[PDB]
Amino acid sequence: KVVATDAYVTRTNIFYHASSSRLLAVGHPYFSIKRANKTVVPKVSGYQYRVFKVVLPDPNKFALPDSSLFDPTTQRLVWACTGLEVGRGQPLGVGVSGHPFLNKYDDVENSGSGGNPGQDNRVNVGMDYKQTQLCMVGCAPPLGEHWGKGKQCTNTPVQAGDCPPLELITSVIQDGDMVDTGFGAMNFADLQTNKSDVPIDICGTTCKYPDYLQMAADPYGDRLFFFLRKEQMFARHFFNRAGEVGEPVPDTLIIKGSGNRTSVGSSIYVNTPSGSLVSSEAQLFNKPYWLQKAQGHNNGICWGNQLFVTVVDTTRSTNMTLCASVTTSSTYTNSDYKEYMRHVEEYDLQFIFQLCSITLSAEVVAYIHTMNPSVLEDWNFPDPYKNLSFWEVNLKEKFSSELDQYPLGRKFLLQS
Amino acid sequence: KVVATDAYVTRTNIFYHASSSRLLAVGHPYFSIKRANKTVVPKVSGYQYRVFKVVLPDPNKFALPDSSLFDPTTQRLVWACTGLEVGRGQPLGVGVSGHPFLNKYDDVENSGSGGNPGQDNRVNVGMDYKQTQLCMVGCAPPLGEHWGKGKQCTNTPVQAGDCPPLELITSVIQDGDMVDTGFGAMNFADLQTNKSDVPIDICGTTCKYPDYLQMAADPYGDRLFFFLRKEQMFARHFFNRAGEVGEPVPDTLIIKGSGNRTSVGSSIYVNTPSGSLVSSEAQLFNKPYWLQKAQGHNNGICWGNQLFVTVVDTTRSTNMTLCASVTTSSTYTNSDYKEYMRHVEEYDLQFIFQLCSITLSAEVVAYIHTMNPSVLEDWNFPDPYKNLSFWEVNLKEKFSSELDQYPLGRKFLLQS
Amino acid sequence: KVVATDAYVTRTNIFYHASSSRLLAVGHPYFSIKRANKTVVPKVSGYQYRVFKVVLPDPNKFALPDSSLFDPTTQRLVWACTGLEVGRGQPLGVGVSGHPFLNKYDDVENSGSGGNPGQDNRVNVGMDYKQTQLCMVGCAPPLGEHWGKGKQCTNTPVQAGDCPPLELITSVIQDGDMVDTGFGAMNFADLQTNKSDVPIDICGTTCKYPDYLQMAADPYGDRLFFFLRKEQMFARHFFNRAGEVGEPVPDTLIIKGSGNRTSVGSSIYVNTPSGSLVSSEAQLFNKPYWLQKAQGHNNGICWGNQLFVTVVDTTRSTNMTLCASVTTSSTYTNSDYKEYMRHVEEYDLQFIFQLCSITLSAEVVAYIHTMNPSVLEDWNFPDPYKNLSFWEVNLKEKFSSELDQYPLGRKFLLQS
Amino acid sequence: KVVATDAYVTRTNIFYHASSSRLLAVGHPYFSIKRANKTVVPKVSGYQYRVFKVVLPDPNKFALPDSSLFDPTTQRLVWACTGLEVGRGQPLGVGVSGHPFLNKYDDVENSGSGGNPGQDNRVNVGMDYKQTQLCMVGCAPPLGEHWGKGKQCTNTPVQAGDCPPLELITSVIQDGDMVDTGFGAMNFADLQTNKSDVPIDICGTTCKYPDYLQMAADPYGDRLFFFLRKEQMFARHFFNRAGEVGEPVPDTLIIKGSGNRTSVGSSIYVNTPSGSLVSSEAQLFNKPYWLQKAQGHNNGICWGNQLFVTVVDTTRSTNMTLCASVTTSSTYTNSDYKEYMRHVEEYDLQFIFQLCSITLSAEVVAYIHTMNPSVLEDWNFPDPYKNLSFWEVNLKEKFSSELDQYPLGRKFLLQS
């Protein structure tokens, strides 16, 4: 019932290059800065999803060299993505996140400690996150999965303070969403009510992980033209949580003691992640990718003259430390200086598209009415994505037919 | 509009070898030594850019074997780089930098510590930097990028002690500039006013990172004939900064405590880098590289009879410790000895050039008037780089036509 | 002017095998043991150069099967090295060196420490060195480079206790010389007068590193038939030196404090090395090497009927601990036992040579008078190396024409 | 003089499969358990040599399908090994050894410690050994080398407590002998008289390392049909020995201090080994090996109808902990439980042999009289190995001609 685009989308020899030029994002790696109402400094972190909404010029209204390529009736034009290079322009490095009141009790990796459960045992702890690189391309935004406070309730009926029901929520990955760290893809705002179990840059948001299985199993495959990924982490340190154990260890699994002791220690264990080594050999970016064959049926056809490119790059997450002097005392005094956190991201999106025509027979128009019907409406033969948030990359007025005048174009001529 | 050099630069069969012989740089790995006015011992560190300005003899005035190769009118000569080997002659190793008053408060990697914010909490801390290898070649100096105190100001209007505006500054990489370490490419002299947030060898200078995106996107491509790079690092330790937090954690993200505590700990986290293992298998140097095809349109043509070779090598950054005796007491007394820091760099630049002629038609002269016009002025058909500082490598009177008498020449005959 | 040996040295079909049998070196890994005048136990350490002087029988005086191969007049014979296998016969492992009075002040990697500068702050510290594997072959001994107290002086004129002038000294690598460790290639006896900055096994000697650049740039190339190398290390720990800072941190680089503090901490940082993992996959030895093509012009011709084979192997540096009982008290008492340090090295040098003849014309005799003139004098057509120290390997009376009777010979028949 | 078996041993087309089935060894990883006279629980450790003496049925008395293959006179039969797979059937893991009274004084890796030399400074310390995998095959038992108390004496003449003379002892590796661990191949029972310098599982025995050089240099090569090996380790921790320094540091190498200090610290350094990561990709076993070509002259001929298979596998050295309850008090009391150490090893030896005949001419009988003469005596044309200890693997009555009924046989049909 669902057929590949190669059956009804004819390819041409017309290729175009389009570069987004340098794209810079400068902000705070932990939280947005609002004074007094709206944001003044945005939240820019290396562990954020960069979902670029690349807008392409309509080929049916494009200033083509000759209009004899197609007939205005029965035929329509659409762009097809054949080349891509996501350039990164920052030094490799690892950034750290932390929490001045992290719910850490005792370092459980080695031993300790006797009995000091009290009012507040939160400690100021910092850490580095898991290393994650990924990039996807499609004509529809990607799908992410995360565990959130589920609809109440499986079984019945009573509160309170009990464990919340878990539900795997599939959603659209927006630009600015947090990637997984070292604690899973979950909604920490709802599942961790103490605002102190994970570092401050994720304790009030949600970590989303790409739903590769769902996006690959969809019929048309408009969300995954291709994808590349590299995740790596190891267990840095171990510790236990402070507070009451909601579900204690059964009696059969622990022989109670002990004169002293007698109180079962906190058995809620969590480990800090670590991204380990970052290297140039492990880089996914700064090198071109040619969409020879797509995994889905959509073989790189940018329906609606748009292209969604998702990028996650934690290998350039270095957080710069700024220090401004309020005064200069005769001696060194900490009260004279203010410390600031700043992070930067540099991108250069380069694309190479192939012009394609579609002969609209009665069967083709029927097949295109199903699937996305707006494809026919925009062809003359409201956008539901205005509620989401993407990094708009306007590539209209950026298309060029002189391929050899650009780096990606030169690489295209000498390859494929 | 921009065409490759292969269209208007004809190749010959005449090849020449030129070696810089042994080049030695001995100095202090942390700072220059000035007594009393000018420097007596230079600052020589493995984490510095080595930008060699190789001066080539003018082939139009060269004592060629036969002048019948070209006509003095309508034709001019120019050198083309075809072979290169950057030889390093020191043992592999890692050097350390430090600061006797580094702005480190508490080791935040594990836990701690209660409440000791005071006048001066700076500690004597040392560390090793991120491992970075790179080498570039072009007929124009390379471009580096770094973050500096930006032009004031985006938004308005008031001081003081606030976070300084950030601006991505692209500049020319001079010989002696610092490569990125584990804290980004920034101007620490302006962005960190306490002179104590990073080790002493970078706290008063600027770390520059190559702007690969801009140099690759340049029309003529005079700055990137080719490049090789290898960067790697991991997070060694974590800590927080002392002093006032310029931007506090939002009220929404932390549940305030605590009887005691009540003061939110320092939430300015930065991690020390570490270059990890250095090995012979990871070396980029001591092996020849042949410029088969250039990424830009300039296919290795050394316009102006000069060649800029940039080199970064942190794999031989070992800092030697010297100890001189002032006296020899009966027992061992530290007051009898002076300790010194010394670092050395050994280079051997080997090149192999190809002679080329250019038929100067009306179109060729026109195309060469645009781009660099001095190419025509020097051909008889002020230097803006005298304000910068490069390692001058005079290869005039060093060209030889006997290729088999040199190592790189021997490798050239049996290869390519 | 300099031509390869392939032009004037004709090859034959006569091949010979020669094995040094088992070579054992047993001694002390730190220092030689002299009682009361001369050494009783030699210094045998895995970080020493093993420079074997292999003496070959004169082919002009050899009992060849038939003398009709060459004419006694106008022609002479010489051996050419075509096969080599350096067999190591000890378990892989890492040995440690140390110093009971090492000039280590504070562990500067993490933090600390306040203010304890005093008479003697030396600590008993041990460490493992950088892993280094290398092997070379030539008809002349190899050249090593190291930094020593240079000739005084560049600039003028006064003492005392100042930093000594540094000079890169090239010398001949003798059997027993120390390889670089983690503190560089320098003459610790002259540049470090306190006898306490590096462990005891290098603090009174000199660490030499091979000058690959000079030996490769040699015209005839008699010192490098070939070479193989593998170096690796990382930064284990960081610390600073005790004693007065000979070159203080410049004022412009530190903001003076602090009520307390006020005294700038020791800013002379040096890091302990570590050879990391040793594995069988990283071994260079126990496998044959065939000299197919030489980098220099000397294509494996053993002039003077001798061959210098240099070997460095730190992957078998395990130091055995011996414990001898002086008495046996009723209980355990440390005074009853003496602990000793012992290190061993097992080698098996295997060679396969090819007989070659040289037709001595007037031009050939002239070319051989220049270069090494003793080649003609010994042919009948004082040794300057008796002042140096090499491991004499007499392979006369060890040549055999039955190749299949030996391991390297069997590997030779089935290969090359 | 020595010729390969291919010259006088004719091959046939008859192949047989033989499997040892599952072989299990369960015991104590540290020491044998003797109550009261003889052993009740054997010493089973992952760091032991597994030397299997595989006994083959006599082909001259074997029930072959047809006796027309050979003539009973002038011809004899012998088995030849062509396929082998040593299957391991335990989970991968690392086991630890230790000593409740290990001769460890101060942790010398970092710093410390002042002055606490006393009666007994032994500490309870545990560690993991170096990872070692190896397997060998031959018709004669393998040769191991180790350093032992040498014959007295080189030079003369006196005791006591002095360093014992070292001698490289070559011996036969028996089943149960200890492999090298991290402290070399030596006889700890004789060279370390305090019974406290190494963990308990090697402090009273001898660690043997294979003498690859000698076994490869044997004329006939009956001991090394082939071998495979993988060794890896790194330096975990550093420390010094307690007790008297038998050979002190010379005065010339240390500047004596210091008011305090004055006593030179213990300069006998030794490092704990560590096998690092064990992985499935590094496994040598559970995969077949086909003896295509032998390194020696013996091309897999099992003289005497026997086959020696040596195996070392430390990747499955996990030591299981057993806990038996003597009583069950109301609370938890350590006096109620006994802790035990247990280690297991699972093997499955699979072989595939090729039947071979030998034409006994006058020269063949002479050549076989030399070498092993018992080969002719057993052919009718006491065992010196009964004093040693091997794992007897009786493969008589286990030969099968149906190759496809077994895993190794199936792999043989589809390979070689």
From TrEMBL, chains A, B, C, D:
<dbReference type="GO" id="GO:0042025">
    <property type="term" value="C:host cell nucleus"/>
</dbReference>
<dbReference type="GO" id="GO:0019062">
    <property type="term" value="P:virion attachment to host cell"/>
</dbReference>
<keyword id="KW-1162">Viral penetration into host cytoplasm</keyword>
<keyword id="KW-1164">Virus endocytosis by host</keyword>
<keyword id="KW-0945">Host-virus interaction</keyword>
<keyword id="KW-0426">Late protein</keyword>
<dbReference type="GO" id="GO:0005198">
    <property type="term" value="F:structural molecule activity"/>
</dbReference>
<keyword id="KW-1145">T=7 icosahedral capsid protein</keyword>
<dbReference type="InterPro" id="IPR036973">
    <property type="entry name" value="Capsid_L1_sf_Papillomavir"/>
</dbReference>
<keyword id="KW-0946">Virion</keyword>
<protein>
    <recommendedName>
        <fullName>Major capsid protein L1</fullName>
    </recommendedName>
</protein>
<keyword id="KW-1048">Host nucleus</keyword>
<dbReference type="Pfam" id="PF00500">
    <property type="entry name" value="Late_protein_L1"/>
</dbReference>
<keyword id="KW-1161">Viral attachment to host cell</keyword>
<dbReference type="GO" id="GO:0039620">
    <property type="term" value="C:T=7 icosahedral viral capsid"/>
</dbReference>
<dbReference type="InterPro" id="IPR002210">
    <property type="entry name" value="Capsid_L1_Papillomavir"/>
</dbReference>
<keyword id="KW-0167">Capsid protein</keyword>
<comment type="subunit">
    <text>Self-assembles into homopentamers. The capsid has an icosahedral symmetry and consists of 72 capsomers, with each capsomer being a pentamer of L1. Interacts with the minor capsid protein L2; this interaction is necessary for viral genome encapsidation. Interacts with protein E2; this interaction enhances E2-dependent replication and transcription activation.</text>
</comment>
<dbReference type="InterPro" id="IPR011222">
    <property type="entry name" value="dsDNA_vir_gr_I_capsid"/>
</dbReference>
<comment type="similarity">
    <text>Belongs to the papillomaviridae L1 protein family.</text>
</comment>
<dbReference type="GO" id="GO:0075509">
    <property type="term" value="P:endocytosis involved in viral entry into host cell"/>
</dbReference>
<keyword id="KW-1160">Virus entry into host cell</keyword>
<comment type="function">
    <text>Forms an icosahedral capsid with a T=7 symmetry and a 50 nm diameter. The capsid is composed of 72 pentamers linked to each other by disulfide bonds and associated with L2 proteins. Binds to heparan sulfate proteoglycans on cell surface of basal layer keratinocytes to provide initial virion attachment. This binding mediates a conformational change in the virus capsid that facilitates efficient infection. The virion enters the host cell via endocytosis. During virus trafficking, L1 protein dissociates from the viral DNA and the genomic DNA is released to the host nucleus.</text>
</comment>
<keyword id="KW-1015">Disulfide bond</keyword>
